[PDB]
Point group: C4
Chain length 354, copies 4
Amino acid sequence: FQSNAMWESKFVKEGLTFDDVLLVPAKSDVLPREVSVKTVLSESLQLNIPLISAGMDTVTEADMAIAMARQGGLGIIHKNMSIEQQAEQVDKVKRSGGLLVGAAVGVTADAMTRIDALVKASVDAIVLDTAHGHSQGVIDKVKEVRAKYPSLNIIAGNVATAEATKALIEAGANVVKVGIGPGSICTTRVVAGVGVPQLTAVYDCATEARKHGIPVIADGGIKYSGDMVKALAAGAHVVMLGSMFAGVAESPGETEIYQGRQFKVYRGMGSVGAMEKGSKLVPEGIEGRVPYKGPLADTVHQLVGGLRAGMGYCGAQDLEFLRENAQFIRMSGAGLLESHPHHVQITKEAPNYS
Amino acid sequence: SNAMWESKFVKEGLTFDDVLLVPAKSDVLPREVSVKTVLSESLQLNIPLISAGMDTVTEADMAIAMARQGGLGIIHKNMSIEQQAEQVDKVKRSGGLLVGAAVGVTADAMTRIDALVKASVDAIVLDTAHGHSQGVIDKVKEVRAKYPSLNIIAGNVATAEATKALIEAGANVVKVGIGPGSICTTRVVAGVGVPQLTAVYDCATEARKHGIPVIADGGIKYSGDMVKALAAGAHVVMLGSMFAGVAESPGETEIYQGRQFKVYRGMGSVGAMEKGKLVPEGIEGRVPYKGPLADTVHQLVGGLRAGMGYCGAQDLEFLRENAQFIRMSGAGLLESHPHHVQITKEAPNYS
Amino acid sequence: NAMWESKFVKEGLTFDDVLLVPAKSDVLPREVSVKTVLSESLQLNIPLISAGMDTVTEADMAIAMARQGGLGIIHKNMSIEQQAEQVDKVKRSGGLLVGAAVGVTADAMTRIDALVKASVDAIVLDTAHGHSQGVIDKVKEVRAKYPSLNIIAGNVATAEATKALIEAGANVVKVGIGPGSICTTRVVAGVGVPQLTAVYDCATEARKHGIPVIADGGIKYSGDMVKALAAGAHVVMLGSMFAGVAESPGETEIYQGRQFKVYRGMGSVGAMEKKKLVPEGIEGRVPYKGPLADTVHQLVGGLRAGMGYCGAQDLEFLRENAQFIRMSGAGLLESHPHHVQITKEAPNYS
Amino acid sequence: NAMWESKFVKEGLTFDDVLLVPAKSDVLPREVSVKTVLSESLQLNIPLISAGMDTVTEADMAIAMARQGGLGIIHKNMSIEQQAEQVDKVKRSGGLLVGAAVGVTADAMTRIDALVKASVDAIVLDTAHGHSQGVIDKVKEVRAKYPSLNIIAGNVATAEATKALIEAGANVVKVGIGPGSICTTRVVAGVGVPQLTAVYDCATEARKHGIPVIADGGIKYSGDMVKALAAGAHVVMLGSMFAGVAESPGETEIYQGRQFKVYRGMGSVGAMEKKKLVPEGIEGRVPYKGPLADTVHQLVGGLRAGMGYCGAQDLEFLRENAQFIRMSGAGLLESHPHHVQITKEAPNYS
Ligand SMILES: C=C(C)c1cccc(C(C)(C)NC(=O)Nc2ccc(Cl)c(N[C@@H]3OC[C@@H](O)[C@@H](O)[C@H]3O)c2)c1
Ligand SMILES: C=C(C)c1cccc(C(C)(C)NC(=O)Nc2ccc(Cl)c(N[C@@H]3OC[C@@H](O)[C@@H](O)[C@H]3O)c2)c1
Ligand SMILES: C=C(C)c1cccc(C(C)(C)NC(=O)Nc2ccc(Cl)c(N[C@@H]3OC[C@@H](O)[C@@H](O)[C@H]3O)c2)c1
Ligand SMILES: C=C(C)c1cccc(C(C)(C)NC(=O)Nc2ccc(Cl)c(N[C@@H]3OC[C@@H](O)[C@@H](O)[C@H]3O)c2)c1
Ligand SMILES: O=c1[nH]cnc2c1ncn2[C@@H]1O[C@H](COP(=O)(O)O)[C@@H](O)[C@H]1O
Ligand SMILES: O=c1[nH]cnc2c1ncn2[C@@H]1O[C@H](COP(=O)(O)O)[C@@H](O)[C@H]1O
Ligand SMILES: O=c1[nH]cnc2c1ncn2[C@@H]1O[C@H](COP(=O)(O)O)[C@@H](O)[C@H]1O
Ligand SMILES: O=c1[nH]cnc2c1ncn2[C@@H]1O[C@H](COP(=O)(O)O)[C@@H](O)[C@H]1O
Ligand SMILES: [K+]
Ligand SMILES: [K+]
Ligand SMILES: [K+]
Ligand SMILES: [K+]
């Protein structure tokens, strides 16, 4: 009947994102240079740094995955290519000294065929990427892959609620990817009206996944290295970055001079440009440019450096302590203005602030 | 009694940019969801879109295009009674299409309604600035007593009491929206308004008891705002600025800075009132030319279908009854839009 | 330990935080009564007062304001003789109501005596901090010598300060610490109360004694005046919205083909000159708007629209029954015109 | 589970989130006392300390700050002999008070020995994270060797951190992690506390031991200083507001016809080289302001006006009695001047 308790709970929940909070410094006994940033995603997947490059056609291919793995991270080779081409990218990364590599797979009828070639190429993890992870199609596809490959690392997403996280874990997924709408090139929340603020989404999903011993991945919305520290402190084992990697030298594509500086193309996989590469349509992403940042090593050094400093401020020896003990404090828009530089004209741009 | 003095600053309101829709378990794909909606027995739409009854938005060509897309058009009342009845008759002659017409609360209101009924209009829109007026209530009772089977759309209102008053007067559809229009200054020049998402939610809460649908009119800037309006209790949304740049809109295309634009102004603006001193409650402006209506409608329905898919809603009734929101700050809004990226090209659904 | 734990308890609201809730209405906007009674000998046909500033109100402004049904406050940045002649000029042109600003100094009573001889209708004892012992002692001194004189005291922003001035003998209290468009008090001194909360807090106290309050400062559109009156104020005082009017002092200057007029705070460097100075105001310019009658028509028109939305037959009903709803910053962007390139200016929105 | 469920419970306020509520005042701004006592051997006529940065305070700045009634902290980006000569130069200029900054290294004890022999008045054991064991162990090592030396330890932003440094030997605590105008700690590390909540939380613990705190960073206008003192701080520390005066280190540059001075964070690349460093500061420029005396007069002038609004005859009354009121971003826009095109620059606003 009309006894709709859902009607009066429509506007009950509240959500927080990175710019809403700060990490509260605590007693510390460990220097930043001696903290442990290693993380374990499964029994056959350990990362020395908690950084994964996104599986997008302007972010990660073979050269990016090789450079990411040599930094201690992981690269997800995108799926906007043929099955044999993607397997050739995976095989190229594997032969380069026994490095880790991942590959993205869509939820289509041809998914099992693509996963077969990736497993034959000795892929370490597949990423069942989709816009709405909490669908029956993704759930059924996780179970079919789990039955065929019991020892394969499966990364499933994207989700933003605890119930969605529970459904993917009991379907076979050993890693859950969190993020509906936070991406720098994403318009899902604008054209569809759906999303969860990324920090609340990471906290709600990690709350459910910690009951089963499953890690979660913070995917999208990270603009500065401090946002990565907040995502890990909110419960995530590892973060996935797109915009902060699209400008590095190992990224696909060359440099074009724009506004007098070198720029690189960065576009969403749900944009018009990306969807036509693998084919009106209602897009959920945009196309654009990010500044050129030189080699990947210089960017990863700044990222890890900011994490080590933040863990020093919080007294975290390893990521598990930060995940379980770090406390936040909420601030208003005025607090954000105070957090950034203010009332001073910046002359030289810093390696970690633009 | 100091009850009214102590409750002045108690209520709180939310707009579209304050909230997001929470994803839920989904068994349906966006292309297999149903966007149909029923306002009454004699007024069913294939898509939940109504074009605003404004002189720069909807005339005969716009109403014909809206109906052939599955929606509805409201012929504006800034014309003679014979001209509005003739435009209604043109739309009906184009294949029995659904069409509406706007009527004010004046002395010639019944005369204009008499001519619109003879033209076989499908719905009368008694539109006024303050729907919670005694004159508006009396007019609805005067029309309902004369035409017991006529679809009467009354507005605009923004509170639960006003919704109950118009329903008890005879209105079978209620229009919600005081202030949120893109060309509206009512909240600025008069200080009166209710945040549109809270207004829709409060009016639908009262209207759902009596089985009366509400129209979310004004404030919609992207296709995601329409999803939030329907999820908040609205059966159908009304759009103005989203339809002004469409080729089927009345008025020719102007050239400004080489680009193509179309005039868009509020019915309470100075220019609109001089057509048919003054204290205006709207402004006059221009919007970019968007081309044929079919391209704009495709993007709007596509975002709605994607939104219903995220929420696991097969039909619009499930969205109204089950969709949950989450509140966010301004920082959440900035995260929701694209950010820290130099946009290269404009998207079809993101301007 | 109670004062230490209550430092951050209070919350405050301003005009852009709220909207008025429409209500059942049986009255058309052209039927409403905008009259207001400040005292037995001070009745206004419109709830509008022009601020006592040297770029807003002099003889010509006060004459035009009073003819529209309002009131003008002649500023005090002039000699006693010159201010007495300004007041007499307004009285000699039809017997119009007029007010005059007076500061708290040793010269205060001498200036008040000349204004009273000029048949001034209301003295505005305007100071930066109305909640001081010097201002209170001055109000008792003036009321003792002039029992029938209308005394407007300010500025204050708390219920405690409102009660102190009423018990001192003031019959009208002026509210506003910081919200002025040219004011920097909250920036340079860190002190203030959000104007809508200040009006409501002071009106809550003043209504117990049957004393009206003036909402002074922060009004940038006609809708802000409606909110201030609905929050408990009997009348509003405007500065920036009258500084561009032709009847204001100063000439019109043209900048990039558009006319402007000078507008500055009385605590700015320029006003007090007319290194050792620490100002609490800035100096700037506002667009030229032409005759006062056009601005007043838009102002009263916007008020009549708002009173119609609220079902207020008179200002006393709106003062006691109007309800607000709070909104965020996204609600403010929705309230203003948005996502449309504005082609031409409106007479009440620029 | 308790630590997991309390992650997002606390809420923090900054300067632009609140205003000071005006109260009854029997005291004029010119007759209030702005003196403060940090310890028995460190008393200041005005509550101003210039930051220990290579673009803010050296010998000339500390001399001018001391002659104005404040204190200057010699930065540590120089050899031990250079810093001792700078401290000695300030002492030779009429027995003026001077402070010196010291880092937490193995060289710290040797640097402190040379500063003590130069008759330094207070050392500033400054570091990025004052709530670490190395900073605690260093304070205890310095306190044991110099029981009468004024030790200012920081930086911190938590009551627990304040207690740890107090029990280690520090008689003055410096509050501030993030709010600096040139600081990017909160951006690149994600760590910080809104400055006004940090000052209030740390002063809450410090006052239970009779220990003063220093509000360090985030002050953009004179009103922010009044809020920091009213939040519980005995004295404020300024960097950006002092870097543009003549007495600060560096020389004047020209940019777009105006005069500027270089101002950079000590955690910036330029300050540390004086691509392996991960900086927590930026390099920039600030407009030239002239002699220090003109800036100090506007700062103290804002404090005297704010204390007059609050009815605080001394700084102790302001810390113990001043009440705040919270406001939204709309209230912040009302606080600043608005809807008026500013024509002239005020000596205390932009
Ligand atoms: C004012 C700032 C912020 C600043 C100034 C100059 C330079 C810095 C740099 C950029 C170097 N960043 C920094 O040192 N970050 C930091 C972060 C977290 C922690 Cl826990 C620590 N912990 C230890 O504290 C004790 C002492 O040994 C310190 O040297 C350090 O090793 C340090 C920053
Ligand atoms: C990263 C994003 C957002 C993105 C990337 C590339 C492309 C897209 C596009 C723009 C194509 N939009 C999208 O797919 N929208 C969407 C919306 C709502 C729902 Cl419920 C679904 N549901 C189904 O999920 C399971 C699987 O069947 C999927 O194929 C899908 O049909 C999809 C978006
Ligand atoms: C805001 C919109 C959409 C708008 C559109 C065109 C024009 C207007 C104008 C600018 C004319 N302003 C308006 O009419 N203001 C208004 C304010 C308050 C009240 Cl109470 C009323 N009451 C109505 O008076 C007339 C009659 O319809 C009565 O029945 C009653 O409803 C009207 C505004
Ligand atoms: C409208 C403003 C703000 C303004 C207008 C013109 C000039 C001013 C100036 C810039 C001069 N600042 C000012 O006076 N600041 C102020 C601050 C705090 C207090 Cl407590 C007081 N107390 C007053 O001392 C003198 C005496 O009148 C006392 O009775 C009492 O009123 C004054 C400001
Ligand atoms: O076009 C798209 N629409 C919505 N989300 C996208 C799209 N393309 C990439 N994403 C997401 O955004 C993430 C990277 O965004 P960023 O790191 O914040 O710039 C990816 O890992 C995806 O999860
Ligand atoms: O001038 C006016 N004043 C106030 N509201 C108006 C005016 N003109 C149109 N509207 C409203 O605004 C709606 C369209 O606004 P939009 O869809 O946001 O651009 C219309 O359907 C009316 O409800
Ligand atoms: O310089 C000043 N400092 C602080 N407040 C002022 C100053 N000058 C005028 N005001 C106040 O600001 C009001 C007008 O401001 P406005 O109408 O909002 O622009 C006046 O009536 C005074 O109450
Ligand atoms: O580079 C740095 N990183 C972080 N904080 C800094 C740095 N340099 C100075 N600070 C802090 O910022 C204060 C001055 O900043 P300001 O007065 O707000 O502009 C100093 O007293 C230090 O506490
Ligand atoms: K900062
Ligand atoms: K986004
Ligand atoms: K509007
Ligand atoms: K102001």
